[PDB]
Design a binder for this molecule. Sequence first.
Ligand SMILES: *CC(=O)N1CCN(Cc2cccs2)CC1
Ligand SMILES: *CC(=O)N1CCN(Cc2cccs2)CC1
Lengths: 304, 304
Amino acid sequence: SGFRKMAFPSGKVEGCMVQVTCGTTTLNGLWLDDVVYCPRHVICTSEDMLNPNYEDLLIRKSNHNFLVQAGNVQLRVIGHSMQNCVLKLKVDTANPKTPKYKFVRIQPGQTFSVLACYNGSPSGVYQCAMRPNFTIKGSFLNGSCGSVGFNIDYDCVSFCYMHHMELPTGVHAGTDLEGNFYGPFVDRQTAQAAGTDTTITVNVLAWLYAAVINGDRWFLNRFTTTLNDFNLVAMKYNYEPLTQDHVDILGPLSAQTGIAVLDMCASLKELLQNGMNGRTILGSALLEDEFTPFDVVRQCSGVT
Amino acid sequence: SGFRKMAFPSGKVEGCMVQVTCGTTTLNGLWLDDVVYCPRHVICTSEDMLNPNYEDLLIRKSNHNFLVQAGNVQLRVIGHSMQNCVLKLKVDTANPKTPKYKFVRIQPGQTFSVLACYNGSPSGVYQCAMRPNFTIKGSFLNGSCGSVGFNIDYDCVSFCYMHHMELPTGVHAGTDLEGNFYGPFVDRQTAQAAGTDTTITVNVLAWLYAAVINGDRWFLNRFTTTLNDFNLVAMKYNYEPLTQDHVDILGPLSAQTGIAVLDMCASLKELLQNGMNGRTILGSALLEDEFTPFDVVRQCSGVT
Ligand SMILES: *CC(=O)N1CCN(Cc2cccs2)CC1
Ligand SMILES: *CC(=O)N1CCN(Cc2cccs2)CC1
């Protein structure tokens, strides 16, 4: 028992982190097979970041200008190309620690682990979610760019995020491993404001199921609701509308606990309207929305 | 910017996890050099757990009865001994992935990362603190015992915890790597109740400093207090008394932010007496106490 914000074991990803330096700029790169992936803004000076023309800036860079270092050993760059907002640096050596991997582009509401790195060296691992406004709430200082987000399915790492930017509001923006940003963000030092950070309703319900499984049951009530009635309340509280697809995904949690999804919706509706009244659920005083239904099942069953 | 509950990268510890089976019982073991460490309750049947006499039960076990498997390869057990509540199984092969390591016994208030494992296989990593009542609030199902808690200082892993038990209240108890339990807990299926889970005051203040560094400043007020005045409030709210040692440890955070430790104490005092009023600090609606002053400095500076 017990329920924690848990990240995937990071070892498989630690074996892929390298340092990439171009001129005076240093960030992280992801070494998979004979390719090192990194944000294209590694070619920029802080002055270039104002209105960069990446294709033009890249013309002034040759293979020998990209310094790639894995631990204390240098990798030889034999090619470079730009794909959207990432650079792909072909090196002459395949990463011997390359795990089974995939590049996936996640949807908002999906969670992942981040291995925050500086100078190609891992500093820590934490769990994130792709917010409905396509930002993530991470922990990233200067030098952390190129750190990646991932999920693991037994022995295959699905990389889903690469860190590129911090908005003036302290929230983060990045790309998938094809270099396409999540949301409307651009790799430029300009005014970029995030939209409404709505709450991921299906995740809150999954977390309420985890609370019941782990003994926290005070919030269970004698009520039920419908999807349409619940959604009137979800609209008022800036929660994502709940769909039948979300109800279907909560099926296994409903089956395990014996609590119908719409009854859990009614508990969530009372929690939104009445508040917590100074009480906690799984050690939290707010409704947690960065656990998906799959994360709850995984943690509650002990998948390795 | 951004501040997250961050665990250490787990790779160094993943390389040490093995499965240990004795009879019909399977849990995790920690393989360092040619020794595998695991909870001594691996020798028990659920029936033995009621009132086990470990020295007597161990007499019926020989080296060949301890099945140790690292991945899909079996390790040969050439010796076994009991040290307090852990068994040390000497194997004929040194773990080639043994990192630089130390065994440390932590104090309450200290934080650490847990690599939750099942059948010697890592499932996830999360951050914990040794509570003032010597329990930890983890996420551990049957089979998770033998999972370890650790801190890393650059390339040396300091192992501080090994999972052994879950109390009826859903909280966890375990030992250091010498087999001595934290607190008064015993490895027996008996009535064991935890004492008051008081809040780690110095950790809350460190986290308030992290909030100011990361932009959350609404709780800063025009007041100050003394250690004795603050402690009258800390007593009322089940917070640990603050000492001059704690004030000294907060020195670097005070220096960085320009906020005197006693002024931050006064902010915390108002937060305790007035509550949050529906507001949040670093995405939390309660005062977080599982970040030490050292964790805050580490995360805010990017130590790898
Ligand atoms: C994440 C990180 O390391 N940095 C340093 C480089 N910086 C370049 C810029 C991208 C957009 C505007 S400036 C991003 C943050
Ligand atoms: C943590 C874990 O794997 N388990 C299974 C074995 N169980 C034995 C007992 C220890 C004290 C009472 S029963 C502990 C939990």
